[PDB]
Design an enzyme around this catalytic site. Structure first.
Site, PDB file in Angstrom:
ATOM      1  CD  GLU A 137      39.253  42.262  48.228  1.00 11.36           C
ATOM      2  OE1 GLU A 137      39.599  41.129  47.661  1.00 11.36           O
ATOM      3  OE2 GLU A 137      38.200  42.830  47.755  1.00 11.36           O
ATOM      4  CG  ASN A 163      40.141  36.633  39.402  1.00  8.40           C
ATOM      5  OD1 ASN A 163      40.920  37.679  39.296  1.00  8.40           O
ATOM      6  ND2 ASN A 163      39.667  36.486  40.539  1.00  8.40           N
ATOM      7  CG  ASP A 180      38.836  36.745  34.217  1.00  9.83           C
ATOM      8  OD1 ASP A 180      39.762  36.716  34.866  1.00  9.83           O
ATOM      9  OD2 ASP A 180      38.181  38.050  34.261  1.00  9.83           O
ATOM     10  CB  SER A 235      42.303  38.525  35.410  1.00 11.82           C
ATOM     11  OG  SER A 235      41.278  38.410  36.336  1.00 11.82           O
ATOM     12  CG  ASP A 259      41.776  39.450  41.965  1.00 16.89           C
ATOM     13  OD1 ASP A 259      41.655  39.830  41.047  1.00 16.89           O
ATOM     14  OD2 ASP A 259      40.854  38.876  42.558  1.00 16.89           O
ATOM     15  CG  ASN A 272      41.607  41.480  38.139  1.00 19.49           C
ATOM     16  OD1 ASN A 272      41.164  40.291  38.518  1.00 19.49           O
ATOM     17  ND2 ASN A 272      41.542  41.662  36.954  1.00 19.49           N
TER      18      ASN A 272
END
Ligand SMILES: [Cl-]
Ligand code: NA
Ligand SMILES: [Ru+3]
Ligand SMILES: [Ru+3]
Ligand SMILES: [Ru+3]
Length: 129
Positions: free
Chosen positions: A35, A46, A48, A50, A52, A59
């Site tokens: 990660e 991301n 969309d 969003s 992380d 997220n």
């Protein structure tokens, strides 16, 4: 902070992750590795909209508030910035909620794709714990 492998394993163990919801310590360390490369300051946007955050790439769509993910929730009740701290407490307590949410560690795509089913104990090999 960029944690060392054993350093993180120890911190995760102190914070209650060893066998949390049945996931051995090495699962958690492997997921952090893929990660974030063990970097608490890791962020990734991301497509969309969003983002992380932190060592487990938690997220903003569901889990934390960053004020820039329209329509999102904040199920851990924290600012996303809390997830970037050198202190892993916020990341750890949020991760507990996530892994308890029904799909276990499959919530972390990099865990499913790189850790699941592998020799995860290697991640804690040689560490004092
Ligand atoms: Cl599970
Ligand atoms: Na959010
Ligand atoms: Ru700590
Ligand atoms: Ru839920
Ligand atoms: Ru959910």
């Amino acid at each position: 902070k960029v944690f060392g492998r054993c350093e993180l394993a120890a911190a995760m163990k102190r914070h209650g992750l060893d066998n949390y919801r049945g996931y051995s310590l090495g699962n958690w360390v492997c997921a952090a590795k893929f990660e974030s490369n063990f970097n608490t300051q890791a962020t990734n946007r991301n497509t969309d909209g969003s983002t992380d955050y932190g060592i487990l790439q938690i997220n903003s769509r569901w889990w934390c508030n960053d004020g820039r993910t329209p329509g999102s929730r904040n199920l851990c009740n924290i600012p996303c910035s809390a997830l970037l701290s050198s202190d892993i407490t916020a990341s750890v307590n949020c991760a507990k909620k996530i892994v308890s949410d029904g799909n276990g560690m499959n919530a972390w795509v990099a865990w499913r794709n790189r850790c699941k089913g592998t020799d995860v104990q290697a991640w804690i090999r040689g560490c004092r714990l």
